[model samples]
Target: MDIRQMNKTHLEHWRGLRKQLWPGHPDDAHLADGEEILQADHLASFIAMADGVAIGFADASIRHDYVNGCDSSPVVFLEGIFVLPSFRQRGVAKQLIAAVQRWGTNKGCREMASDTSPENTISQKVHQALGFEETERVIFYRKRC
Candidate 1:
């Protein structure tokens, strides 16, 4: 297994797997989001490669806005982590997170955070396995005009 930090040379790899990772509503939305990530200094990502093929990815960032349960500014947040089904359970995700953790520390972050839908127990468990503790859970409603 080899891990590579996101670089201009790897945008295509990142962009391709991003669709499988997040699967944005209609695809293009996620493409635009990748562009935004490319322009941000506060955010970072890593792609996992196996035998020269992408197997997974992880994303993180220092969010200026309030992050649930974070007790400090610039919350180093795990935006997302995804491993291909065939590649999971073999430490691919863990490797990606280790990269994110190191990246966050280099950015001066003392705390790391993440969130998932209440129904996603697997995600919660994954976070726990990665050394994150559950802090808060809340529900929100949207009002349409």
Candidate 2:
């Protein structure tokens, strides 16, 4: 499998993966988000391909704000990662993460972090599989005006 960085030519393929990863959003939203990522310096994304067909993707960004259980000022936060179920056992996620880590390192980030819903045990397992340690978990509350 090949992991390619996000670019205009590959935006559609990345958007396809993003749609599956975040199915709640409309297609235009995903496309817009992909475009936005391509235009941001602190943001990064990768598409995993097999013979030119995209099978998965990962999105990340550098956060200078406080990150849970992290000790650095600028941390590379994993915004999202998704692999086609058919591609799961082939280390696609690992390769995608390696790409993100390299990008973070180039940007002088001292750490990497991510968060998942409390009920997403599968996602939590995937994070651990990719070498992320379990950090503190907290319940978030929201107030609407």
Candidate 3:
């Protein structure tokens, strides 16, 4: 798998996978959103391509604000990561994250962190495999007044 940062040459393929990740989303909508993201120099997005098909992606950024359980400012936060079913367990996901780690290292970040839904055992396992530890966990609530 060839992993590269999200850019103009790869947006078409990236957009296809982006649409699949979001339920009920039309093609163009994701394109518009992806375009804005790809243009940002402050963020990093890496995509996995196998023979012109996008199999996975990882999104990351320097989060200066609170990120669930991080203790440091400007942590390299893994915003999200996804792999198509066929591409899972083959190290494509690992490579995607490695790219983000490299990007963060270049940006002078000391820590990299990410979180997943509590029920996603697979995601937890992946993070652990990459050396992320369980820091803290909490639930959320909203009250409609």
> What TM-score fits each model?
0.90, 0.93, 0.86
Q: Compared with the true structure, what per-residue lDDT tens digits does model 1 show for residues 6-101? A: 776677777778778666556777667667777899988888999988789888898888887988877788888888899889989889988888
lDDT tens digits by residue: candidate 3, 18-133: 66676687766877767777777668789999997788988788777887777776788887888999878999988998899999888877789898889999999999998899
List ranges where model 3 is wrong by over 4 Å: 24-29, 141-145
Write model 2 residue lDDT over 1-145, tens digit each, in one string: 8898888888888887888888898987886787788889999898898988889999999999999899987999889999999989788888999999999989999899999998999888888988899989898899998
Pick by TM-score: 1 or 3, better one? 1
Of the pair 2 and 3, which is ahead by lDDT?
Answer: 2
All models: lDDT? 0.83, 0.89, 0.83
Better model by TM-score, 1 or 2? Answer: 2
Best by TM-score: 2
Model 1 stretches with alpha carbons more than 4 Å out? 143-145
Tell me the deviation in Å of residue 53 in model 1: 1.4
Which residue pairs in candidate 1 have backbone atoms (N, alpha carbon, C) closer than 3 angstroms, thus clashing?
Answer: none
Would you list the clashing residue pairs of candidate 2? none
Cα deviation of 20 in candidate 3 (Å)?
Answer: 2.8
Native-to-model Cα distance after best TM-score fit, residue 94 in candidate 1, in Å: 0.9
